[PDB]
Design a protein around this ligand. Structure first.
Ligand code: HEM
Ligand SMILES: CCCCCCCCCCCCO[C@@H]1O[C@H](CO)[C@@H](O[C@H]2O[C@H](CO)[C@@H](O)[C@H](O)[C@H]2O)[C@H](O)[C@H]1O
Ligand code: SF4
Ligand code: SF4
Ligand code: FCO
Ligand SMILES: [Cl-]
Ligand code: NI
Lengths: 581, 179, 300, 581, 304
């Protein structure tokens, strides 16, 4: 066993080794390994992505206009963000400029993905970390009613309602078929919700799992379907007809009416079910505002997203601000450039890939996706990893670094970047949120902080949905209808040789697509996805990723039951197929 | 059945029918794939793509039946029946091969029939066409969709065109040279 | 009274199928899980992780051996001894085989488990292979689509539970109900197609009137699904209605069948690109010059 | 002014005359006139239908298979019942016999119409008679919450919820644009609901006006659309395909799933919103169990409906029993026959029609629809009726009589007939309902009785929906799929000359279609509709209709504000285009 | 901030249009009434009856003279001095005329107000005449259908409120958006009609696969509506999807254009597969008699 210092942390692989494989209630395949000491405190964390498909390899020689379709299928959870990132990049390459409505629509697609994705995470994925499902059976419905009513103006709150929910669950469990709750962690001393809050939570879990499906109808309108909607280089396929013959063949007043109604319902739901539940989880699990800080008080990153001036990815346009903080200096929010080779780099000295020189970092335009599985002395075999070898290669996830710095991306990062940039909206949203919890600003830089921001972001996104819709309608009122540019749709008209960058904020963090074209064909296509940042292995200098960082110094109550581990991990919203692609 | 009875003309009346169906098949067939420029307004009353589709399908029938019996005659009138020796006939005939254009032509049109009827019968008419449902099962085993049957069918058209270019020269080479 | 046990595993996947299944409007995803089946294992939703999740798996496949349904989403990789998808420290293919042998029947969800989907498109780096190429001793229902229609997934489920039998399949393993007819067969824009009325370029006058997308490379003509009839997301819309051509995302190897915006597409056996036209026109010009050579050989 | 006795009543047209024209919150066109004395008690009532279109005349000489489509358009409120009545009759005439599923589906269509029609009436039409909308503005949301929760397990009951509802109404009214509440009756002393019940009521009014739309989706599945779904002589067009190629072109497992989900939601809604509100309106407006009795304790009629054995309209099959009671003798429930000329008759001596002899009554098979507007000395003119002349002709509604007896039809009638026939289900539903209100059985024979029964009937119908569904599914399970018979679809195969009777219970009462065929053409088609029974003018013997009867002896608090009149009338659920056709 | 005043009257009607309007899924009927317009008079929903209802009417048409929208559902009879439809003791046509003269524009809801609908079918006993034949000095938007599609009604309303203008119309008076294209041209079963694949009698093998209803007298080929595209009741279904042919219920005098169950005159029909089939069997037959003499099989299929 060896020991070294990095980023203010003491990484020590001596002491009992715990293995969490497979990580559940995440997207895709993750393996997590740790070391604990005599005080049951994590002194080493190992973040391994246990899947790979190779989109970067597949994309080569393809018609760039076909690319969005391929890379959308990177992830079904964050469905659509990759397509957006694609079209963005191909347009950056060819030099295509889309019509206003195309943008306004795309922004709607993204705001929709945020609202839906965040909601499903909070309940279906992360929820059970905090809500002791089986403890709901010991709740008094009348007090559950009284509680929900004290926190929220949400209509569904009758004592009879919570009683049916309780009984249905009692029916479910009564047969010995716990299903998804089977061999869970219920009764762990870190579950801190009272009987009544547990039932309130679980009822909301089911309501959410019902409502989620309706949000995506917005995708179904513009995109055609969800999961995996459709897009084009040049704008959007979903031509609009409002008062001419054959509006039945297009986006029309009725279709727009559908969208409108889902916006209202989505906003209302998030604001009155998720938002209050987030604050309530904050209330009862308060000490978690100091556990799982990780990189969030050192290095955070945002590219920026939601360009409100069409085809202007500049600062004066992106409604969700970009920027980076390093070394915990939040007073100086540095500008990020995706073209600059001394900024975004990817080291693979600890990943299962092959480079000419594996000690240097490659900027995505120089990216090399050459898979090479090679785990080394893992004390087992190649077909049986009992214990990963973190000294060498140990993940299918490449290690990206902003200027060599290990970064955290995602909702929490977006919030700190936005806050310290001076964003009028965000300074009022965070200050009131933390004041409501009687916690200081720093309380936000935590495992609890991550959940709280995500919920805030869904609220923001749903707000923004209505804003975008309105923008679209004002254009329609004002005779502006165009949805696509076709001037450069033909390959004959593209530069013989060119390249471009596609960037946005996916629900999980900062997303970039770097693409290169040669003779109407994809020459190179490289992807750097949010969870690739967060779940990142170590680099040459031994620096740790956002994940391994947030797990360090975390106290475990029961070592064989890794709830404390799951809590911290899920709060980042892991998406492995995204991270590995 | 809408009509009945004809009798039969001289045999060259069945060659001309083929070439005509052949040509008609090619034109129409080409525009199934690379369709003409879009027309406009009130679909109820117009039906262009459908006719160049209809003519194609029925030309196919006339073609298929003309060819099935054009062959039925060729090898019953032959009396040559009713690998080892095919690699010994090409080894003393190298020590004018347009008879391998008869075999090429023959096989190409047969290939076209099989591929085309795999596509035509797939709205499962259920009737006699069940054999052609193996053809689809094949192309899936091949690697993919019924789409490939289109791609390969179209390929047949060009390859058939090649044999025409190789015929009509071979033809007008001797029609001109009339010494 | 007891619900039927279901085990749900994931190989190399994007998780679009589990996302789809939960979009179900009737019956509700919720109601499926609480009332119609006992979803006993699903990495994406279950409480247990790590050696707890390992324990549920082992426990369920043992106690319900021969009795449970195996849902599979995504596919197994064969390359690098199968470690392109590791599960509990071992290749995924081992977890699949061990769940398959214990199951009574298998539901292959989406194009991934049915055909191979994206991970298996050229150059296929992980050697992703479909379930029916790896598990050959069990009944496998292929429900393709990237993803399949939420209400179709659920509907197939309800069919199997209500009628206590496997749906009837085409000679390809797909349930007949939703995969018996092509999109082009029940397209609302068919009127325009046969008419000769096509979108030529996006957002043109034609496109605004909802003309046929054939010329924008729609693959509906060769794609068996129910999107034109049943439609996506509580019958709201589908690819074609929303202005894009069918990609054919329920069809075997559709990723490799030329461009999506193209009619007349890549024949993968002809290599790199070479389409029907390309190879045909190559041959046409060959014999066109072979004519030039014998005509120049007219020494009369 | 003249005075005479009839049916235990003293009809006196002396004293102030009050005119309520047009009657609102009903279907179609009605005029009501009354006379009051010194004690402000109604001593004369006049029931006039002020519209006519003439379906019976139009139908003549058309293909009997086209008839359902024409007569369905008799009424858009009770949409579909007339089509059902039609097919029934043409099949009775030709001798058709439909497959089991066709029936099970048709019964579904009807149960659906019952659920929907009753619901919309209770809230949108009749509701405002009992619920003082503007008084909701004086309610305390917290107590409104506490009240709703005491009455019902319905989820939507949070104090915040009732507050938003109140505020939205306050916003609505605040602008001076009362809209539909404009110049209403609010503050009348007969409004007896407390502030909190008024808000609870109004919130339900809106929830109902929202939910009602979803119920008819069941029609949309099988019928194609609602309003005005589609049908066929021979069964139903909606062919079923469950497991074979092309199930996408038919009723399939997904479609049946949709229906299923609507059934669940409709049942749940009625049981937890309407049912409780009905009982609650009963609680606070209790003295109305003795006002507006009318004919309900003398003569009541049901034809019967919902044949569970397919093509068997006998007693042993109709799930909703038939029968008639006369002279208040409920121990002897007489059998009804629609063929028998001495049973159902129609006198027009007080209607605007022409008969050879206008003193006799004509059974529908001898029916004559010859319109002849002739009001007589109305003290005004032909184009200006200031006061109808009830001594002569005064309505577009024919006067039907069962064996000369003036009958009441509808939900209250169906209930007494069902009850006194010994129906196990109905004796338990009524006894518990009246016991819950601490009211005797006779309390049900009233204006309040009418509302209560309607609510009970919706509950029954929604229960029966699930029953019919299950039946259909059991057939599908059992390989029974047929939805239509086609043997006698061709006119060449019909009797050269024949006749038939179609009968069922529409939401409002007893419906009959009498049809005659000659050489493949409609020779005669006569209709006797529920509201034709209830709103009936007088006959030769001067006997009064169900309406005019229920209005007699009613005390009015304010004469110029006819709430007492509207309450009594709406409780019958008037449908004038139905009554007149 | 104030909502736009709407007056809604009813003549001879079945009330299927008001029934339809309230079925609207987006925006909700509720939300239209509380937020989008001020529905100031509607016999079917309003609190006031009798001389109270009379008073609201008079007050609204007076105070908002020139400023309000007139919705009309159903139509006026002309026979028997118009007394086939009496309102407040006087002919309906009088209430219509007084409401019309004060309105800025008129929506004619359904086939009744647009064309005449059922009350106006042979022999038309009440002499029902459409609104455009009685009110000739105002703009009238005809939104036909028996009824029109709820979401279309509401959508038309939202267009007018959002865009502050009347929808574009064909020469007929119908909004172009939903009435610009025939049912037959956005029919999901066109594929079958194109092939020559028809339902021949109800519940036959054809009908089970959802083949074309053309031969069951479907009149979609001559009916302008949006039912095949927008569809009924939150996009659940429509006439044709549910197995019945279009009756043409949005088209002038459709009640009188023969039976609902018969063909449809002067629509070009020529089957892709049907014709080719006949060509094949007609050619096979030629060779069959010329060489063989017809086919007496034994397996009839054999391929297994
Ligand atoms: C040598 C004669 C033939 C020629 C030149 C020919 C040519 C073609 C071509 C070029 C296409 C376009 C495919 C594409 O580009 O996607 C096509 C499609 C087609 N052909 Fe042929 N073909 C021949 C024989 C046949 C026969 C015998 C049949 C039997 C019915 C047939 C039936 C079809 C069908 C069903 C299609 C697809 C139509 C659609 O997409 O709706 N062909 N043909
Ligand atoms: O005639 C023929 O036309 C086709 C297409 O234009 C050409 O075809 C050429 O382009 C295609 C497409 O890039 C190449 O893959 C092909 O190998 C090449 O021969 C031939 O050179 C010419 O002989
Ligand atoms: S869009 Fe596609 S499926 Fe639809 S009619 Fe056109 S070619 Fe057929
Ligand atoms: S059912 Fe009617 S509208 Fe539909 S394709 Fe057939 S003829 Fe056209
Ligand atoms: N959000 C999301 Fe998916 C990840 N990580 C992407 O991009
Ligand atoms: Cl529109
Ligand atoms: Ni009615």
């Amino acid at each position: 066993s060896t020991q070294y210092e990095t980023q203010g942390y003491t990484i020590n692989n001596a002491g009992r080794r715990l293995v969490v494989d497979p990580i559940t209630r995440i997207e895709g395949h993750m393996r997590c390994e740790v070391n604990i000491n005599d005080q049951n405190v994590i002194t080493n964390a190992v973040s391994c992505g246990t899947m790979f498909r190779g989109l970067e390899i597949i994309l080569q020689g393809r018609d760039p206009r076909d690319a969005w379709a391929f890379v959308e299928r990177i992830c079904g959870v964050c469905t659509g963000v990759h397509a957006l990132a694609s079209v963005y990049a191909i347009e950056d390459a060819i030099g295509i400029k889309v019509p206003d409505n195309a943008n306004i629509i795309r922004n709607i697609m993204l705001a929709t993905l945020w609202c839906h994705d965040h909601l499903v995470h909070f309940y279906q994925l992360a929820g059970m970390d905090w809500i002791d499902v089986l403890d709901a059976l010991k709740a008094d419905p009348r007090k559950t009613s009284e509680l929900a009513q004290s926190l929220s103006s949400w209509p569904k709150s009758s004592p009879g309602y919570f009683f049916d929910v309780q009984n249905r669950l009692k029916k479910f469990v009564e047969g010995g078929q716990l299903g998804i709750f089977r061999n869970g962690y219920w009764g762990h001393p870190q579950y801190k919700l009272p009987p009544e809050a547990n039932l309130m939570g679980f009822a909301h879990y089911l309501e959410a799992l019902d409502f989620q499906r309706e949000i995506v109808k917005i995708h179904a309108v513009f995109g055609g379907k969800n999961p995996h909607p459709n897009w084009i280089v040049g704008g959007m396929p979903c031509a609009i007809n409002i008062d001419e013959s054959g509006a039945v063949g297009a986006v029309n007043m009725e279709r727009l009416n559908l969208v409108q109604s889902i916006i209202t319902r989505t906003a209302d739901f998030i604001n009155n079910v998720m938002i209050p539940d987030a604050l309530a989880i904050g209330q009862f699990n308060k000490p978690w505002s100091e556990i799982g800080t990780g990189l969030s008080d050192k290095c955070v990153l945002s590219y920026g997203a939601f360009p409100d001036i069409a085809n202007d990815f500049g600062e004066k346009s992106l409604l969700m601000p970009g920027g980076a903080v390093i070394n915990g200096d939040f007073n100086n929010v540095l500008p990020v450039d995706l073209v600059d080779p001394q900024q975004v780099q990817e080291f693979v000295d600890h990943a299962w890939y092959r480079y000419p020189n594996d000690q240097v970092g490659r900027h995505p335009f120089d990216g090399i996706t050459d898979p090479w599985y090679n785990p080394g002395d893992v004390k087992g075999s190649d077909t049986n990893i009992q214990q990963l070898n973190e000294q060498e290669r140990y993940s299918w996830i490449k290690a990206p670094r902003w200027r060599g710095n290990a970064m955290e991306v995602g909702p929490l990062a977006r919030t700190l970047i936005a806050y310290h940039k001076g964003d009028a909206a965000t300074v009022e949203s965070v200050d009131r949120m933390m004041s409501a919890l009687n916690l200081p600003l720093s309380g936000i830089q935590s495992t609890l902080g991550r959940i709280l921001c995500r919920a805030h972001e869904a609220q923001w996104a749903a707000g923004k949905l209505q804003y975008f819709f309105d923008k679209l309608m004002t254009n329609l009122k004002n005779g502006n209808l165009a949805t696509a540019s076709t001037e450069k749709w033909e390959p004959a008209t593209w530069p013989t040789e060119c390249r471009g960058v596609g960037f946005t904020e996916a629900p999980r963090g900062a997303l970039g697509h770097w693409a290169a074209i040669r003779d109407g064909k994809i020459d190179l296509y490289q992807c750097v996805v949010p969870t690739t940042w967060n779940a990142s292995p170590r680099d040459p200098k031994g620096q740790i990723g956002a994940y391994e960082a947030a797990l360090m110094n975390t106290k475990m109550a029961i070592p064989e039951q890794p709830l404390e581990i799951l809590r911290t991990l899920h709060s980042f919203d892991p998406c492995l197929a995204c991270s590995t692609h | 059945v809408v009509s009945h009875y004809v009798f039969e003309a001289p045999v060259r009346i069945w060659h001309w029918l083929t070439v005509l169906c052949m040509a008609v098949l090619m034109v129409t067939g080409y525009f199934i794939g690379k369709p003409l420029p879009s027309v406009s307004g009130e679909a109820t009353y117009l039906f262009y793509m459908g006719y160049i589709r209809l003519i194609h399908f029925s030309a196919g029938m006339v073609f298929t039946v003309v060819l099935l019996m054009r062959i039925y005659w060729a090898f019953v009138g032959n009396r040559y029946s009713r690998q080892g020796v095919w690699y010994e006939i090409r080894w003393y005939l190298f020590l004018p091969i347009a008879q391998a254009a008869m075999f090429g032509y023959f096989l190409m049109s047969v290939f076209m029939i099989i591929t085309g009827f795999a596509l035509y019968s797939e709205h499962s008419q259920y009737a006699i066409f069940a054999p052609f449902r193996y053809v689809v099962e094949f192309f899936y085993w091949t690697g993919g969709n019924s789409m490939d049957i289109h791609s390969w069918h179209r390929l047949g058209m060009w390859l058939i065109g090649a044999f025409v270019i190789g015929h009509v020269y071979m033809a007008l080479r001797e029609d001109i040279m009339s010494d | 009274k007891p619900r039927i046990p279901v085990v749900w595993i994931h190989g190399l996947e994007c998780t679009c199928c589990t996302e789809s299944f939960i979009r179900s409007a009737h019956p509700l995803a919720k109601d499926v899980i609480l009332s119609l089946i006992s979803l006993d294992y699903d990495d994406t939703l279950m409480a247990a992780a790590g050696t707890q999740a390992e324990e549920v798996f082992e426990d369920i496949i043992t106690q319900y051996n021969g009795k449970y349904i195996l849902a599979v989403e995504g596919n197994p990789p064969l390359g690098e001894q199968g470690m392109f998808c590791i599960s509990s420290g071992r290749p995924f293919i081992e977890k699949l085989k061990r769940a398959a042998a214990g199951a009574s029947a298998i539901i292959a969800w989406g194009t991934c488990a049915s055909w191979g989907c994206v991970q298996a498109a050229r150059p296929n780096p992980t050697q992703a292979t479909p379930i029916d190429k790896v598990i050959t001793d069990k009944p496998i229902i292929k429900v393709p689509g990237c993803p399949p229609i939420p209400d179709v997934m659920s509907a197939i489920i309800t069919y199997m539970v209500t009628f206590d039998r496997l749906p009837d399949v085409d000679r390809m393993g797909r349930p007949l109900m939703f995969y018996g007819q092509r999109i082009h067969d029940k397209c609302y824009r068919r009127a325009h197609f046969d008419a000769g009325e096509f979108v030529q370029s996006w957002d043109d006058d034609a496109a605004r009137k909802g003309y046929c997308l054939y010329k924008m490379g729609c693959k509906g003509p060769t794609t068996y699904n129910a999107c034109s009839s049943t439609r996506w997301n509580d019958g709201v819309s589908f690819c074609i209605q929303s202005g894009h051509g069918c990609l054919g995302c329920a069809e075997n190897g559709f990723w490799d069948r030329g461009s999506f915006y193209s009619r007349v597409v890549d024949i993968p056996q002809m290599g790199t690109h070479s389409t029907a036209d390309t190879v045909g026109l190559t041959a046409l010009g060959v014999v066109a010059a072979a004519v030039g050579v014998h005509a120049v050989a007219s020494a009369v």
